[PDB]
């Protein structure tokens, strides 16, 4: 492509730039693997 970038619009502003990893208090993947 290397084209079709000209102007922006609303709702496209930077949002949720930092994701949220699973905490050990909520869900742990290893604890789910060893889960009873």
């Amino acid at each position: 492509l290397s084209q079709l970038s000209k102007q922006y619009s609303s709702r496209d502003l930077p949002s949720h730039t930092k994701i949220k990893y699973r905490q050990t208090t909520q869900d742990a993947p290893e604890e789910v693997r060893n889960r009873d």
Binding site: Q3, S5, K6, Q7, Y8, D12, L13, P14
Partner: protein, 146 residues
Amino acid sequence: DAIARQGQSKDKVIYSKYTDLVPKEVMNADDPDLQRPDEEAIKEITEKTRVALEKSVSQKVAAAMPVRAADKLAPAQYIRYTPSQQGVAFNSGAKQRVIRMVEMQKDPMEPPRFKINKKIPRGPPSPPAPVMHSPSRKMTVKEQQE
């Protein structure tokens, strides 16, 4: 059988002969065949997906977010290469006739450069494949008339 490869042919087709109609033997228990490669394959594949998604997400996410990118760049880009392997009369330079290649001046306050906004939606076709299906039985008079 190679006539089915006419047109664009690169890697994945996997239909030429009809030997793929019926499967091979039956389900068996094998570690490499019936499960997956090692964990290093998913690790290197995930890292490669992070590099490709990092470059594509960096270009698309950078252009979609007018943070004005950076100042310019530093590609002094000294280019030593054969001029299309010309072999012209006498010599147009010394050795491969290297040239100095730097970046371009930045963009001024005026956004417009070349405006298109034209319409050319779709227009390429797609290569047809074989049917690769077991022909069934017709409906005759009763099921078709039903």
